């Protein structure tokens, strides 16, 4: 079909967040069988394999941003691979890893489709500059490189010289914001980004939230949608084995509803499953709940509706 | 600012409910740092300290109501302290303890503002008389002393001779009722109190419930609002270390939404955090979830919106 034609791109990268272990991000999302659970329904899955990420030995930090050249090279390599799989007409399923990969995962996606939108399901806004950061991590700063309206307010970080800004401020929608910096909320209200934080999700319900999201991004003109999902955007009772768990977020139900309404537009054209950390489960059953949740999110992105799916042939014979 | 000017009043009192341990109610809500988590945003926090509660040795019971003089003296002392901090223009953050303190926590609040309203978030209605009770506890009877329409149906309990009724029947709104006596529901339907039990919360959603609550109390005239929150009004998967846990209640999300919509009226003028019992957690992690939940509820009452908060100065420099 046009949709559910998946090119999986693994990304074992952990130098944008401190809690290591997301190097085994694609390892666990594949050994829990994302491919074979995609291959029941008609998903032409082509595994492009995990990427080889080089290890720069002289990784001198920035002022506050630490390990910047590793993230620059990893996101440049990932943006090349994503533009490769989007010139093949597939849907770039990137799965990591951490949100420090989303710089390349959206830049390479915009090398093929320059007028996309991003639905950013995360607990956090991830919109810090290298100046407004307090953390100094790059799993908290992907969006600020990608917005066109923050050019000039971003210093020339070592490694990010290739990053051309790709999306506008009014072409990114947040869902599930509940842990926002003061600097992040100042940027979020200055640029006027249409966000749906947990206040608005509790106000409207996830049906009205997804309706207003799809009317905001697709109501003007049909265009590709890049769900950059994150697994702390769900509640930690569903995904506890994630890097920065923030309590009281989206349920497993509401997460599946977001993904199903993105699928039934028929314009999902890129997906990110980030921050899966299979070593922060206090039991391995916690890791099992996290990875089964992320697998079910990915499957509901690519056609597994909870109502069920039938092949269009007769079964009553 | 006008709001978020908090005068904290501790209240280590446990003689209105049988499960002792809420004597260490303010002890744990302060050693989890409610003050310092208030002091990031501009909250002029002034700790008025825990109260000294005298121990009456000849505490003879009533017919069914047991320990009545201790609750009478504790609520008289607390009502004096609350009227003291409301003549200072602050917001009376009372935190206990148990709902047997809410008699004084609303009487002293009405010594300064005689036309207030109460949003009563509890699993229970707490509206028993000393006659209609079966429990004989006073954590189940604060509201009946405070309603003006139950004068004459309340016997002269030893200790409660000072209690002048303060609020009317149509100036109190319940949210989260799911464990109601027959006597309590008879009073609740005879007086016509506008309650939002879990049937109406599931029907309308917490957005429509809080909209109808604020339209019911503030739609006629601007007046102070006294959120008397209780931590069994939330679901026991979020606050298990409470005195009378009733399953299937408000989520952590819906609880934070109630508090945020009370804040954004700009008329919150008194707060109660009651029934926190740090010895009923079966693990200390259960106590940790309870106290972090109650701290997050209090912070969202006093300005911590989940969208984030910025100081009104430039950060992009």
């Amino acid at each position, epitope marked *: 079909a046009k949709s559910r034609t998946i090119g999986i791109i693994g990304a074992p990268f952990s130098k944008g967040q401190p809690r290591g272990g997301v190097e085994e991000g694609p390892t666990v999302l594949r050994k829990a069988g994302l491919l074979e659970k995609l291959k029941e329904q008609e998903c032409d899955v082509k595994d492009y394999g995990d990427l080889p990420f080089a290890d720069i030995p002289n990784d001198s930090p920035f002022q506050i941003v630490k390990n910047p050249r590793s993230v620059g090279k990893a996101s440049e390599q990932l943006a090349g691979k994503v533009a490769e799989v989007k010139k093949n007409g597939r849907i770039s399923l990137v799965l990591g890893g951490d949100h420090s990969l989303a710089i390349g995962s959206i830049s390479g996606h915009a090398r093929v489709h320059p007028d996309l939108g991003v639905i950013w399901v995360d607990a956090h806004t991830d919109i810090n500059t290298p100046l407004t950061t307090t*953390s100094g991590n790059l799993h908290g700063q992907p969006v600020s490189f990608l917005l066109k309206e923050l050019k000039g307010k971003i210093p020339d970080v070592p490694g990010f010289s290739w990053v051309t800004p790709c999306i506008s401020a009014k072409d990114i929608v947040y869902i599930g914001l509940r*842990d926002v910096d003061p600097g992040e909320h100042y940027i979020l209200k200055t640029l006027g980004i249409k966000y749906f934080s947990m206040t608005e999700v509790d106000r409207l319900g996830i049906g009205k939230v997804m309706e207003e999201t799809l009317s905001y991004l697709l109501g003007r003109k049909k265009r590709p949608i890049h769900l950059s999902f994150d697994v702390d955007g769900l509640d930690p009772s569903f995904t506890p084995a994630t890097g920065t768990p923030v309590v009281g977020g989206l349920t497993y139900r509401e997460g599946l509803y977001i993904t199903e309404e993105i699928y039934k537009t028929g314009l999902l054209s890129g997906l990110d499953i980030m921050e899966v950390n299979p070593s922060l489960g206090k039991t391995p059953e916690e890791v099992t709940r996290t990875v089964n949740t992320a697998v079910a999110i990915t499957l509901a992105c690519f056609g597994l509706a909870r109502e069920g799916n039938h092949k269009p042939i007769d079964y009553l014979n | 600012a006008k709001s978020r000017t908090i005068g904290i009043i501790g209240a280590p009192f446990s003689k209105g409910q049988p499960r002792g341990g809420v004597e260490e109610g303010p002890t744990v809500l302060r050693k989890a740092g409610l003050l310092e988590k208030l002091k990031e945003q501009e909250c002029d926090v002034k700790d008025y300290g825990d109260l000294p509660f005298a121990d009456i040795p000849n505490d003879s019971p009533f017919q069914i109501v047991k320990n009545p003089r201790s609750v009478g003296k504790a609520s008289e002392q607390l009502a004096g302290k609350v009227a003291e901090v409301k003549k200072n223009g602050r917001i009376s953050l009372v935190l206990g303890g148990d709902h047997s303190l809410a008699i004084g926590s609303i009487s002293g609040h009405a010594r300064v503002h005689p036309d207030l309203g109460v949003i009563w978030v509890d699993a229970h209605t707490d509206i028993n008389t000393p006659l209609t009770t079966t429990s004989g506890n006073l954590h189940g009877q604060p509201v009946s002393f405070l309603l003006k329409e139950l004068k004459g149906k309340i016997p002269d309990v030893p200790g409660f001779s000072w209690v002048t009724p303060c609020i009317s029947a149509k100036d109190i709104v319940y949210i989260g009722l799911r464990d109601v006596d027959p006597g309590e529901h008879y009073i609740l339907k005879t007086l016509g109190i506008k309650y939002f039990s879990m049937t109406e919360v599931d029907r309308l959603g917490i957005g429509k419930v809080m909209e109808e609550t604020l339209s019911y109390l503030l739609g006629r005239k601007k007046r102070p609002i006294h959120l008397s929150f209780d931590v069994d009004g939330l679901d026991p998967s979020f606050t298990p270390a409470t005195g009378t846990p009733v399953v299937g209640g408000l989520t952590y999300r819906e609880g934070l939404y109630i508090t945020e919509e009370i804040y954004k009226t700009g008329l919150l003028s008194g707060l109660d955090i009651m029934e926190v019992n740090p010895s009923l957690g079966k693990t200390p*992690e259960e106590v940790t979830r309870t106290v972090n939940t109650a701290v997050a509820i209090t912070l969202a009452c006093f300005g911590l919106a989940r969208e984030g908060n910025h100081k009104p100065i430039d950060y992009l420099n």
Partner: antibody
Amino acid sequence: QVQLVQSGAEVKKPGASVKVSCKASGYTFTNYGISWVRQAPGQGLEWMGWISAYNGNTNYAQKLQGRVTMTTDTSTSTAYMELRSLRSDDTAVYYCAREGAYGYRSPYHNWFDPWGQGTLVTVSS
Amino acid sequence: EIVMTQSPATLSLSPGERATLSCRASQSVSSYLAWYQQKPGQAPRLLIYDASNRATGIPARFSGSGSGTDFTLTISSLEPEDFAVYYCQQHSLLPRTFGGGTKVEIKR
């Protein structure tokens, strides 16, 4: 300056807990997370748990799950480490050091630089 | 449960030349481990925070290398006050094992 003060050298027979204070001065608390590490004399340093001061995250270690409980006292910035069902293998010096909270606002830190001065704990009857 | 192994079990080097050490991991810690200076009966003072970069009050002489399996601690300007039981510590995997002990003696 940035310090951690411990108190005190306590001996418990096999009995009750070894709740040890670790008073955090100099830096802003609720912005880092204190971990704990034991050292038998003439031996290595076994890690034994880490609380965050952002929000009370437990995150204990293997072989004692179980035995340790760890809370915060973030008004007076001390951090506590209890033990349960004590045993004569726990004749160790209990250090406390600061990992940094691995939440989202807390600065990058992996490397233990306030270290407390150590606490003599010998468990014997 | 990554076991961290230190290749010099003991060491005895005079006040003088370089005193290079080794800490071999069981996996790829990838530029995420630390170095300590535990004098006997004292608190283990930090030498190197993340495989290099000379943490905040280290005098002049304690550079190191790593990235990402076996990491080297170099003592280029030996300075005989530095005769302390050194320790390496992985951090970026749980549980957080340390090294074993690298008791630098004195040569006579």
